[PDB]
Design a protein around this ligand. Structure first.
Ligand SMILES: [Fe+3]
Ligand SMILES: [Fe+3]
Ligand SMILES: [Fe+3]
Ligand SMILES: [Fe+3]
Ligand SMILES: [Fe+3]
Ligand SMILES: [Fe+3]
Ligand SMILES: [Mg+2]
Lengths: 363, 350, 350, 363
């Protein structure tokens, strides 16, 4: 399969396909089809079928993205006409959120981690055969079990060299922060395969959805997702993880962008006084951003003053900002309308093209 | 003329023995039979570079800010400051036994009253409250509502349940009834991981990351309708930065426009709500002291009313108490930061 | 004569739509537009062995106990049982949105009242409460306290804060004012890991290990002072086993003797307290159904007053509801388990 | 050189708590860590600089009679020789060092900085062999390792674990994930390679609340509640199939009481009869694992109201897998001369004092 190529089209780093009902079973051991029939997919909830914050309005989906049967993002043809053709996307990164039907929770977050790995492998054989290979404008970010690094490595070693795989997919929430040594075997296998890592928006993880209690209302819930990415950025950087894997690239998918810029700026300011606690950190904390930390744009930050968007993105790092549609979720972003009318064209072109090509290794 | 109020300084408790004059016979006796374990917290680890300035006045053990004498000599030495709001962070909130928690909090406020507020009328102070029991927390506010030398309620940045949950409304009710602002200060009860993704392994990573929890606390307070149930409420974010506020305001605002029918008692934008009800101390300035950047964050905030001056004595930050003047070209903005904005909180005059 | 009460049988909510006739239009509209996510808990996965014995009548989807006629058919077929106490475990307590939790619990109780209690006068029921908001919980018990068909308050075995926390006192106060025992039933709000050492990887492990949480709850309720402040409290442990109680009781008691001044209000031994105020249902029997073992565990509890009969209909357990007879040679004891111990709870006469 | 431990007339004590005198560890610590601890202390899962979340009550929960002239109880090697090793004829007393300083419960392995923690463990193992075991080989060490960083734990088992001074590996009751999780398997593996059983001692911390439904308020709750961690760990170690993977692994639960295990296992078996289909990889009935894999020490002895029940419940657990301990010098110390109820059978008491501990440690 040919290496991806981006010329006059664009990069979309966050697309959510769902398998049709029963679509993963060709790739499932009989033990796990049986387990799911009798047990479902237990996770860090007390709930049989839904996550602990179920989606508020119509499943958080675009009203116009529902195929003639099934869930949105479950129609292969609808995804190529309505998203890939419609916007000339020449690199679309699939981020399979769920096996669909039974559950929308991420496959890697099943409490049974052998089942988790089963579901991740099934998602990976599926998306590669059912979308990537029939339409290689699509490439897969492969979901793996970050909470069992053994199994994550096995799966990166199995698929990770595939030309239809562009990234490794974990979640924004985890049992321990992402710079912890627990996850280093995964970073090592990723690096070994020359694969960047994408962490997407998620519930679960094992701890509450904020560092100080579970949220009540939907604004708290949905705004609250940025907090997890703020904690993971600081962990990943301040752990020295990027001293250990100096070629590792990490992208934060759907955690917004602008908040990272005063996070980093607070990280450096504090570090100026307290760096002695961390005498082996080889660089100033913000010096890791350009080589290691990227962010998807959706949902676009909407400052009260439109000119603050460009400013804040530059303060994060203007090279490390990558367009994403989040097709087909409700707060979907369109490449023509997402950026404010005063937005510098040069920033905008490279958010659409050059920045994703770099992060994903397209040259 | 509104006074130059230093809105965040610290008294540091020498040991739990300093509470024995202010404890009942039962608690005093028990504290001594327990070999008086200290609840000195780890928010500012005593030998780390943030604990105190090299040149702070110190005691016989080399610790700063364990007597009003030492603190007063330093904070007021140069005549600039009119009043200092004392915050004692001694960790009575991490006392799981609820009745010891109540007893030691009340004892701590006595120690602040009798050994700080009585030694210098330029000192004001927050009320330490036992937030493991919001009704007993409400009653500690009530207990000090008549000593207007106590000018605000101390709450930790990380709590057990979010502060906007009904469980905590006695705290907000009692503060509005007392006319007292509520301050969140950096620190926590540590009854869950301090992030939604687990335990930060360094103090550095913990200190920086606690901004995220304030986002959580602010949304909880606003989403649950604290500002409509207790519409005179004023919140002070003490020692938690502020440069993170505008990106948070913008997303809260965006998503409130989607989710207003889920929280229909919220008819004003969280932008406006935060601008009117939330204030923030300036130490640390987290880089807004850099050229032009104080003007920038004010613009991003959409208000020049929110920032109030503090030195965070005796903590050593990267930039100093008045290095904030290098972030702006406006003497009028510095007037609001140095005196006028805090008049909203304390109504103190020269 | 005191009646044969099956102290724990289950009503299963067919889907969230069954709630619509009992919710206001705001919540009824809001439910259909969410596409009606179901809060069906995972405590007895519907496709697993424990969900229902092969003899239980089922519905169009193969589920048992979704209608009163199917449950009543099965539970009373053989004439042994006089009353049955119906518990609905639908996961309203895992609704994070506190107003939706109040509304959905209100609609669930209404559903029990109209589609179960009104349909067979042999049925009684527990009150489901929004335990995320303990003063809404207190108000809910009060609302139903006038309907005497409702005979206890349901709380889950794993709660957000321990049930002896002062935050939770309103619930114990409302239940007492209503003359209602409180049951803890297996289940949880899952707002932390369900064990002190993290998340169990399987349902089997989770279900076995919830007994550890009931020890936490009993020690909290008693130590915190619930049984002195609300001295008419009755605690039923539903479907949590019971063989674990004696070793816990002995350790709580010996440690009470060590820590007297810590809890001065607890002046009776926790053994006597647990024997007076705690009752336990017999399904599952966890091996006490074996030769001599019922006599043995009653000897270890030190009271013949604690065990009350239940079938846990429609659930499947290793031994049957009447297999307990194999573990005793004493008809007196069986008369206590079958009728006279539950009279302390409900005063139901046949 | 030390002779292999020998138990004849004397008795096994599975839990002795020495503490280093102030500065006793410094000849074994890098200066880096010496300076780190001076500034930051030993940071763990509290917001407290010096004390754990539940500081002990009366007299520091230490024996009122075991204090030396200066120093904490257990820091005086001569006092431990006379007051414990001589006074009770202990021939194998297993050291469990749970503090670097002068405190009751502050485990090195639970420092959030896991390099500091591994260093603190390495120092404790050099100290205790040198200062206690080799000068009086009636003591042998249970070596604390970092269970939450497997790589460092294994390296320490490899470094010092074959020393004849060492008879077990030391962990805590409380962990970030249940002990049957795969995270810990690399430690079980290196321990089996060093022919070492594992001891898990009562602890706070671990990363979650001290119950699975909230933090406790009063000391009756805290101290009784320690039992609950051990119940949760037994279930995880059994049901995960850990002992299917490690057929020769032996673990002992230390200071978590014994009786309560028996009805627990009775509940586990009873439930498994119905629900065993969720765990089809398990090779044995869950109760069958006890006899070969799970041991338990006795302190603080259970005290039923009818003292015949103790022996009844110890047998129902496993009469062969209960091991004596004193917990010197804590306040609820058990005297072997008085701990056992009067109707207790001598066969059981004597194998508790000798043969069961001898078989768990391979003596
Ligand atoms: Fe997305
Ligand atoms: Fe999305
Ligand atoms: Fe401060
Ligand atoms: Fe039941
Ligand atoms: Fe011990
Ligand atoms: Fe002990
Ligand atoms: Mg098999």
């Amino acid at each position: 399969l040919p290496a991806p190529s981006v010329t006059t089209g664009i990069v979309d780093a966050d697309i959510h396909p769902v398998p049709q009902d029963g679509a993963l079973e060709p790739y499932l051991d009989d033990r796990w089809k049986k387990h799911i029939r009798e047990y479902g997919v237990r996770t860090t909830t007390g709930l049989q079928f839904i996550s602990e914050y179920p989606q508020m309005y119509g499943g958080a989906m675009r009203a116009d993205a529902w195929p003639e049967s099934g869930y949105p993002g479950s129609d292969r043809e609808l995804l190529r006409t309505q998203l890939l053709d419609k916007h000339n996307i020449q690199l679309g990164v699939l981020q399979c959120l769920a096996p669909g039907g039974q559950t929308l929770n991420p496959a890697g977050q099943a409490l049974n981690q052998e089942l988790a790995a089963a579901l991740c492998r099934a998602t990976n054989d599926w998306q590669l055969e059912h979308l990537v290979y029939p339409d290689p404008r699509m490439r897969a970010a492969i979901p793996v079990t970050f909470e069992t690094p053994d199994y994550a490595v096995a799966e990166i070693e199995r698929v990770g060299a595939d030309p239809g795989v562009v990234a490794v997919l974990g979640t924004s929430k985890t049992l321990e922060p992402l710079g912890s040594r627990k996850y280093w075997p995964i970073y090592e296998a990723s690096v070994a395969q020359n694969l960047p890592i994408q962490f997407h928006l998620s519930q679960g993880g094992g701890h509450a959805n904020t560092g100080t209690g579970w949220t009540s209302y939907h604004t708290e819930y949905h705004t609250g997702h940025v907090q997890s990415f703020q904690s993971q950025l600081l962990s990943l950087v301040l752990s020295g993880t990027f001293d250990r894997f100096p070629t590792l690239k990490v992208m934060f998918v759907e955690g917004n962008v602008a908040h990272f810029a005063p996070l980093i700026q607070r990280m450096d300011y504090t570090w100026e006084t307290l760096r002695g606690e961390l005498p082996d950190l080889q660089r100033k904390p913000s010096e890791y951003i350009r080589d290691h930390i990227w962010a998807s744009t959706q949902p676009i930050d909407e400052p009260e003053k439109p000119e603050h968007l460009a400013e804040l993105l530059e303060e994060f790092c203007g090279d490390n900002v990558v367009f994403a549609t989040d097709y087909p979720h409700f707060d979907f972003d369109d490449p023509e309308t997402a950026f404010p009318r005063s937005f510098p064209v040069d920033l905008r072109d490279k958010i659409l093209r050059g920045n994703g090509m770099r992060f994903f290794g397209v040259t | 003329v509104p006074a130059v109020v230093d809105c965040d300084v610290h008294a540091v408790l020498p040991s739990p023995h300093s509470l024995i004059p202010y404890l009942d016979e039962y608690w005093a006796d028990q504290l001594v039979a327990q070999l008086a374990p200290t609840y000195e917290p780890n928010y500012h680890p005593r030998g780390s570079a943030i604990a105190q300035h090299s040149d702070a006045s110190v005691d016989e053990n080399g610790r700063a800010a364990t007597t009003a004498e030492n603190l007063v000599k330093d904070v007021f030495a140069d005549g600039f400051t009119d009043f200092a709001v004392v915050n004692c962070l001694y960790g009575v909130q991490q006392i799981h036994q609820p009745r010891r928690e109540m007893a030691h909090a009340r004892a701590l406020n006595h120690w602040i009253a009798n050994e700080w507020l009585d030694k210098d009328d330029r000192l004001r102070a927050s009320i330490v409250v036992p937030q493991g029991s919001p009704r007993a927390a409400a009653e500690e506010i009530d207990f000090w509502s008549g000593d207007k030398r106590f000018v605000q309620v101390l709450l930790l940045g990380q709590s057990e349940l979010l502060y906007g949950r009904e469980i905590n409304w006695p705290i907000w009710e009692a503060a509005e009834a007392a006319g007292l602002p509520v301050t969140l200060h950096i620190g926590g009860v540590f009854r869950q991981a301090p992030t939604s993704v687990g335990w930060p392994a360094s103090h550095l990573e913990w200190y920086v990351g606690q901004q995220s929890n304030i986002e959580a606390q602010l949304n909880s307070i606003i989403s649950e309708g604290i500002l409509q149930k207790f519409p005179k409420t004023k919140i002070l974010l003490s020692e938690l930065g502020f440069n993170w506020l505008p990106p948070f305001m913008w997303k809260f605002d965006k998503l409130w426009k989607s989710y207003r029918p889920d929280i229909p008692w919220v008819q004003e934008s969280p932008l406006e709500l935060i601008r009117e009800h939330v204030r923030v101390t300036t130490s640390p300035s987290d880089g807004a002291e850099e050229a032009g950047r104080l003007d920038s964050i004010v613009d991003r905030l959409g208000s020049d009313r929110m920032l109030v001056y503090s030195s965070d004595y005796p903590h050593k930050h990267h930039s100093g108490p008045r290095d904030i003047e290098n972030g702006t070209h406006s003497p009028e903005l510095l007037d609001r930061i140095y005196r006028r904005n805090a008049f909203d909180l304390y109504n103190l005059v020269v």
